[PDB]
Amino acid sequence: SRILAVHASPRGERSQSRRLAEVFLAAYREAHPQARVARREVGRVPLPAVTEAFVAAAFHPQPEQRSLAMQADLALSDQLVGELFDSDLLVISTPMYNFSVPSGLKAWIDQIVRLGVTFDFVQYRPLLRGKRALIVTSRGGHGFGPGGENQAMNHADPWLRTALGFIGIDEVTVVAAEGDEAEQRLLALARSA
């Protein structure tokens, strides 16, 4: 009933991954007029990469002692993770760029995987529970999905699963458009989610 929608393509109207995701979102809203949708742009807008300053603050041995400056370094991070915590369903839209994802999406992941917040260690455990994710991806070529010619070259959505998995999001569904099929699948998913 609460959705965080992460859009990774730098394109606007011409983005296919973005359009497909919004088709899901509109469908889902009709089925649940009560639902909140929060949108997080990581494609058309620059998302800062993790810096050395970020590392120092994020892996501080005594976080309660972080200075004001260090909290500033982690402010966007906190905002990004909060959005996640507040969501029930995470929708990520993304193209396949060079066998992986656009750099902004990688940076988003880099901001949201946080020691003591989304994962812990003692061995690593995940901290997020109750969430599912839907990944809408668009590829220019073909054969990157399960059983495909090029499956092994796919470091986009399969990498996302690993990273989402690390933090606890293990119920993930992937809808891909390569080369109307996906749109229909997305509508069906919107009706039953």
Ligand X SMILES: CN(C)c1ccc(/N=N/c2ccccc2C(=O)O)cc1
Ligand Y SMILES: Cc1cc2nc3c(=O)[nH]c(=O)nc-3n(C[C@H](O)[C@H](O)[C@H](O)COP(=O)(O)O)c2cc1C
Is 9 annotated to bind ligand?
yes
- Residue 98 in the binding site for ligand X (CB under 6 A): yes
Beta carbons within 10 angstroms of residue 4's beta carbon: 23
Q: Residue 189: name the closest of 23, 36, 39, 35 by CA.
A: 23
- Residue 16 in the binding site for ligand Y (CB under 6 A): yes
Report the alpha-carbon distance of residue 100 to residue 3 in Å, rounded: 24
Angle at 95 between CA 169 and CA 128, to 5 degrees: 10
**Residue placing its CB nearer to ligand X in the complex, 98 or 192:** 98
Is 59 annotated to bind ligand?
no
- Residue 80 in the binding site for its own copies (CB under 8 A): no
- Residue 7 in the binding site for ligand Y (CB under 6 A): no
51 binds, among its own copies, ligand X, ligand Y, none (CB under 5 to 8 A by kind): its own copies
Report the alpha-carbon distance of residue 143 to residue 152 in Å, rounded: 10
Q: Residue ranges for the binding site?
A: 9, 15-17, 96-99, 124, 138-141
Interface ranges with ligand X (CB under 6 A) = 55, 59, 98, 124, 140-141, 166
